[PDB]
């Protein structure tokens with residue numbers, strides 16, 4: 001008969017799972033509790049609302065009424081799950097604080113930014129960019145106060161996307177990076193260097209620097225590091241994120257080695273009838289089989305879909321991820337899929353690599369631009385372990401490579417794949433195919 | 444020890460194979476005979492040189508000296524192979540014979556000549572090799588051309604129409620069929636390109652051209668429907684493989700009309716290979732033999748043939764029929780089988796046709812993109828994908844990989860495809876397509 005399903009969080013994962021369950025079991029009572037006023041939202045668009053490319057209401061996919069009226073999901077907004085135990089959840093709503101039973105539970109509860117323990121992080125003008133309310137706050141601050149110098153702490157992709165959003169508004173932007181290069185955790189050097197030459201020109205890039213303090217009157221005026229000081233009337237916090245596991249721990253939910261919630265292929269946790277999905281959830285790597293945490297949106301959506309399916313008695317397996325990701329600074333596109341040279345080495349693979357430059361068009365169609373590719377290959381199988389791409393028109397290479405990795409293509413398999421050619425689209429030898437030829441499969 | 448290798452034709456296929464052989468066997472005598480002055484040339488760029496996007500010398504990649512001096516290939520330009528027999532080739536001024544131990548037909552395909560009167564008037568052109576682009580340019584400089592007429596609704600017709608429309612000319616398209624590209628795509632896909640095409644070109648469907656009229660020069664085109672003022676005509680009513688020399692050697696011709704080959708690109712005659720637009724190949728999905736005269740396949744075939752000639756065994760799996768082109772801002776392409784082709788092949792099929800956007804609603808510049816999918820009901824495998832609108836390349840190339848590997852609808856759904864707001868919407872259109880199908884179980 002009928003069950004009560006409860007879902008914690010109204011991001012991509014939560015809504016994916018709610019939609020899916022209700023879709024499969026219309027007669028079921030599917031409740032969602034979302035702490036904010038925002039549902040079906042894209043934190044991925046925050047830099048572009050901040051940059052001013054978009055109005056803040058566009059961050060919402062559909063109307064909460066679509067979920068409630070049209071799809072029949074008992075959506076509670078401004079509802080924080082504060083306690084959780086086996087079969088129960090405790091929630092605060094009208095002010096008021098009330099308990100609800102559940103037969104199935106989903107943690108779709110995301111991840112929030114790491115708070116670096118330096119003094120003055122709580123000044124007015126210090127911001128983290130994680131949910132849509134952050135975009136509103138940043139906009140209202142800049143309207144109330146004249147912000148001219150901005151300082152970004154962190155060289156991850158969020159740092160970079162945020163830097164772009166302020167540089168594009170004519171601001172003086174300074175980036176503080178602990179590492180020897182940007183994005184050093186997720187990409188190899190010869191790839192990140194290409195984005196850096198560009199970044200360095202539009203941003204004061206400060207490598208190998210540890211921020212000690214944020215100083216300021218009623219709110220932020222300066223940032224002090226182990227090297228120098230930097231004028232700043234706005235600070236963007238983005239020094240990594242961590243999964244929101246505190247409620248899970250209350251239920252004794254197994255936490256994976258990554259820090260995120262352990263799941264299997266069906267997105268089940270260690271606790272029966274309890275699932276986890278999205279940025280909170282640890283998953284599987286398609287190439288290594290190791291468990292890994294990749295808090296991105298497409299995976300998050302799929303996990304939600306998968307969890308819902310299984311909750312509703314329709315067995316379905318998530319194979320895992322490839323770590324596929326893309327972003328851009330100005331006209332410089334950057335992305336990967338599969339393992340970097342570093343990751344593959346860490347995993348004990350016997351690897352060979354290649355790094356090549358090519359063009360996006362033939363020399364007889366104009367507008368051809370530079371594109372660079374790095375490939376990583378297991379010497380014992382000739383299989384592609386990963387691909388990194390930087391320059392322009394990278395998406396078809398990344399998406400195509402991703403398919404290839406899903407299927408375990410070799411260098412020879414890639415070479416003979418029937419990829420498309422017309423002069424307006426690409427050069428006669430696709431850059432991905434050139435890469436494949438470079439390595440040259442053998443034995 | 445050393446062998447004499449001879450290669451007929453200096454297009455993509457010929458040069459691919461010559462480079463490859465010489466690369467593997469530097470001590471071998473590798474001769475190429477190319478009828479024109481052009482080597483390593485791209486007929487694919489002719490519309491854009493005609494449109495004026497490019498100067499005509501950019502149709503050649505590296506100088507002929509790169510091949511001769513730098514790579515050591517005995518390249519003969521302005522050399523037509525006129526006769527061929529077992530072990531010999533006859534070439535032309537001057538006419539002399541050369542021995543061969545291995546032979547490659549890299550000999551392309553030339554346009555079908557429709558047998559209507561006046562096709563040989565000044566101003567009537569075919570667009571197949573680079574000299575054609577030069578001829579078309581010099582004609583337009585010498586004579587004022589204002590009305591252009593294109594015969595044929597294939598991709599060449601369409602690319603040529605764009606090249607004349609973009610120059611402000613009055614362009615009229617005569618098409619025998621009920622729609623453009625009707626041979627290679629389904630209706631609900633071609634219709635999207637047509638709504639656009641119809642606005643910048645006088646599109647005349649279901650019309651058979653009877654006559655080209657003129658004095659010394661073309662002035663008009665007459666069809667079964669009306670007449671059309673015209674000072675320049677493009678004929679693009681299909682192409683056919685150049686097999687006449689092959690027949691002289693008794694080379695097996697496939698059911699398609701092109702030269703039969705196997706995976707190693709060998710013909711029915713020992714030590715004789717074929718590569719490129721002249722060659723019939725294999726279909727990766729159906730296993731049927733098929734002719735797809737396109738450039739990437741042509742290059743690969745050349746590479747494969749060379750490898751095997753030089754004692755390094757290598758197999759070409761075949762093609763998917765992947766292809767893309769564009770009219771103005773309307774991109775069009777496919778990979779794998781259309782609904783029509785799949786039905787012709789006896790598959791039990793289901794399909795889907797969806798519209799999506801290239802960005803999320805919060806990043807601007809999002810445009811419309813439509814996808815058709817064809818799926819075998821007994822395996823859930825993708826048989827083909829068709830795409831029209833904008834930003835189609837990542838869908839087509841990705842789908843192509845998927846077809847190479849035999850992905851199902853579920854395999855596609857769970858593929859880790861990329862997302863950022865500047866690149867695509869949260870649900871990639873390819874993934875939406877896959878979901879639409881829905882993996883069914885017995």
Ligand SMILES: Cc1cc2nc3c(=O)[nH]c(=O)nc-3n(C[C@H](O)[C@H](O)[C@H](O)COP(=O)(O)OP(=O)(O)OC[C@H]3O[C@@H](n4cnc5c(N)ncnc54)[C@H](O)[C@@H]3O)c2cc1C
Nearest residue numbers: 009011012013035043044080081110130278279296297863
């Ligand atoms: C600036 C930025 C840029 C990004 N860019 C990209 C990109 O380019 N590409 C990409 O693939 N991914 C990107 N991501 C990641 C992407 O936004 C997430 O992976 C995706 O939103 C995951 O959805 P989710 O539901 O798992 O978690 P989230 O979307 O983070 O949302 C979780 C929700 O749960 C709610 N919640 C938390 N605790 C409670 C509680 N106790 N009670 C009730 N509700 C609660 C929160 O209010 C929150 O709204 C980006 C993220 C950020 C912050």
Ligand SMILES: Cc1cc2nc3c(=O)[nH]c(=O)nc-3n(C[C@H](O)[C@H](O)[C@H](O)COP(=O)(O)OP(=O)(O)OC[C@H]3O[C@@H](n4cnc5c(N)ncnc54)[C@H](O)[C@@H]3O)c2cc1C
Nearest residue numbers: 422452454455456477478487523524551571719720737738
């Ligand atoms: C207008 C047009 C647009 C195109 N657009 C696309 C596209 O968008 N995408 C795509 O993938 N493909 C396209 N193609 C196809 C592509 O150009 C060919 O597949 C490719 O050039 C094949 O190379 P090939 O050497 O096999 O044949 P070809 O390139 O035709 O070259 C064969 C050569 O052999 C020579 N030859 C012939 N007979 C003799 C003889 N007796 N002796 C000596 N030499 C001889 C010819 O002079 C010719 O140069 C297009 C073709 C045309 C004409």
Ligand SMILES: CC(C)(COP(=O)(O)OP(=O)(O)OC[C@H]1O[C@@H](n2cnc3c(N)ncnc32)[C@H](O)[C@@H]1OP(=O)(O)O)[C@@H](O)C(=O)NCCC(=O)NCCS
Nearest residue numbers: 012015016019040041042043044061297797798869875878
């Ligand atoms: C949209 C959403 C809530 C997930 O719910 P969903 O209903 O599974 O997603 P969709 O709205 O695409 O799917 C609706 C249904 O219509 C179908 N559909 C029909 N025509 C379609 C078309 N032209 N395009 C897309 N989907 C179509 C879908 O395939 C799906 O099928 P189903 O009925 O078998 O489930 C979720 O993706 C979401 O929260 N999105 C916005 C926020 C976001 O993802 N941002 C994350 C961080 S950037």
Ligand SMILES: CC(C)(COP(=O)(O)OP(=O)(O)OC[C@H]1O[C@@H](n2cnc3c(N)ncnc32)[C@H](O)[C@@H]1OP(=O)(O)O)[C@@H](O)C(=O)NCCC(=O)NCCS
Nearest residue numbers: 356357358428437438455458459462483484485486487738
């Ligand atoms: C170029 C052509 C002659 C084939 O020659 P090829 O040697 O097979 O291909 P390339 O010249 O690209 O390869 C040269 C070598 O350097 C390498 N290389 C080429 N470009 C490279 C790059 N950008 N970065 C790194 N390495 C590269 C290749 O891997 C190749 O390796 P090999 O030494 O193992 O052979 C053939 O493709 C051709 O005729 N092209 C012109 C025709 C055309 O483009 N269009 C035809 C119809 S539109």
